[PDB]
Amino acid sequence: MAIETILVINKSGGLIYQRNFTNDEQKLNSNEYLILASTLHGVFAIASQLTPKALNTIPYIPYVGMDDFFKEPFTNWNKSGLRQLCTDQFTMFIYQTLTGLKFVAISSSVMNLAIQIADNFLRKVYCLYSDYVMKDPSYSMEMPIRSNLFDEKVKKMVENLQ
């Protein structure tokens, strides 16, 4: 459901975006997010390789954010890979695109339908990424997201959520 921190990591490990909005404090904000993002890329690699002797992903439209971005049930792209961590204080969602660009959403609202409401928000942040960061000639590839339009295009949609 709810989101408290957007983290956008690269296709090569280290992150390119995070905003820990409504922290109501000053949190720790330096290279510990870089080593956290690389740790999530590593455990996303490791959770492929262990799988037992077994050898889905159809969301819907819940009207998140208030015309909207899409209409129809779709698929995912990662099966042998980490999808959702669950703990007591928070709950971490993650969403891989097809090209390899993982989106991480830390959630301060805890306790399967949260996947259904979660990835229909994490694709609506992917549409704002592809609309407002890809068409940006000052933005080179493989570089932190220094654009200031991307912040208050996603802030409106997340305060439209919660």
């Binding site: 799988t51 037992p52 002797k53 099966k79 042998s80 669950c86 007591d88 204080q89």
Partner: protein, 151 residues
Amino acid sequence: GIYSFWIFDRHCNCIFDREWTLASNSASKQNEEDAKLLYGMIFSLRSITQKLSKGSVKNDIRSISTGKYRVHTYCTASGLWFVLLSDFKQQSYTQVLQYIYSHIYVKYVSNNLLSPYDFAENENEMRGQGTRKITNRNFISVLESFLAPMV
């Protein structure tokens, strides 16, 4: 329902690993391809949870999903971790995971006094790099007995 059941000690050793479809309950051939990297997974996520935990009582992992299976954990305060790889369509198995600790492990391992309570084999090659197991006869029988309705 249940793919695999594992224990990990304080001194970083897998000591029990039941893999189903009537596979090995022992670390003969399925060792080292997921044992001390499953332990590395849970240790890395347990390490990043304590840096990210506000409040006073710091938390620990309750479940790690993937797109296919789930990992369930119960990390006791003495450093002895019950991890359990399951299917979908059913909620948290934390009640079963403390039932095992409250009626099988303390009934038949710690109150067994023939066997060691496993902390090491008492060397400095017990930090991660030594192997040993439990194999108490009554323990394995009731532990294969209880999980067997959960197919």
